[PDB]
């Protein structure tokens, strides 16, 4: 099931990390939520769960991206990150 999260960054972070990418052995080469920081943006917003698949960041699909490219997607200059995830 696909869900939508709007996160306001705090001190440059969204309060979660990711694993995966096409150059890794995760299922489908996808990007998955790894850790979530207590009291961070993702934790406070409440929807994101560890293990969910991150499909899209700010309207840009992560399909086909390497690990480094997805991380770069999450570390951009905008104050707000618009994320699309799969419950996994």
């Amino acid at each position: 099931e696909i869900y939508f999260v709007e996160l306001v960054k705090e001190d440059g972070t969204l309060g979660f990390s990711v694993t995966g990418g096409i150059n890794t052995s995760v299922p489908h080469g996808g990007i998955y939520v790894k850790s979530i920081i207590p009291g961070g943006p993702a934790a406070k917003e409440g929807q994101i769960l560890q293990g969910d698949r991150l499909l899209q960041v700010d309207g840009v699909s992560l399909c086909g991206l390497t690990h480094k490219q997805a991380v770069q997607c999450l570390k951009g200059p905008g104050q707000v990150a618009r994320l699309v995830l799969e419950r996994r």
Side-chain angles (χ1 to χ4, degrees), residues 3 8 12-13 19-20 24 29 33 42 49 51 58 61-62 64 71 75 78 80-81 83 87:
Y3 66 97
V8 181
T13 187
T19 65
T24 71
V33 173
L49 299 182
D58 294 327
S61 175
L62 303 190
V71 175
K75 293 303 180 173
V80 182
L83 312 169
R87 176 52 40 79

Side-chain angles (χ1 to χ4, degrees), residues 41-61:
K44 297 208 295 292
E45 194 276 345
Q47 281 190 97
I48 290 172
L49 299 182
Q50 184 236 37
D52 284 353
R53 181 177 178 172
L54 176 65
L55 293 190
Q56 190 190 69
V57 174
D58 294 327
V60 173
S61 175

Side-chain angles (χ1 to χ4, degrees), residues 9 14 16-24 29-32 54-58 60-71 73-76 83:
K9 295 181 176 177
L14 296 167
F16 71 92
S17 60
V18 298
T19 65
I22 57 156
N23 60 321
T24 71
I31 301 296
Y32 299 92
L54 176 65
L55 293 190
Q56 190 190 69
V57 174
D58 294 327
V60 173
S61 175
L62 303 190
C63 180
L65 274 59
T66 66
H67 185 80
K68 186 190 279 200
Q69 296 172 334
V71 175
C73 278
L74 290 168
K75 293 303 180 173
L83 312 169

Side-chain angles (χ1 to χ4, degrees), residues 23-42:
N23 60 321
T24 71
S25 294
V26 297
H28 315 296
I31 301 296
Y32 299 92
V33 173
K34 185 216 291 207
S35 310
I36 298 172
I37 306 304

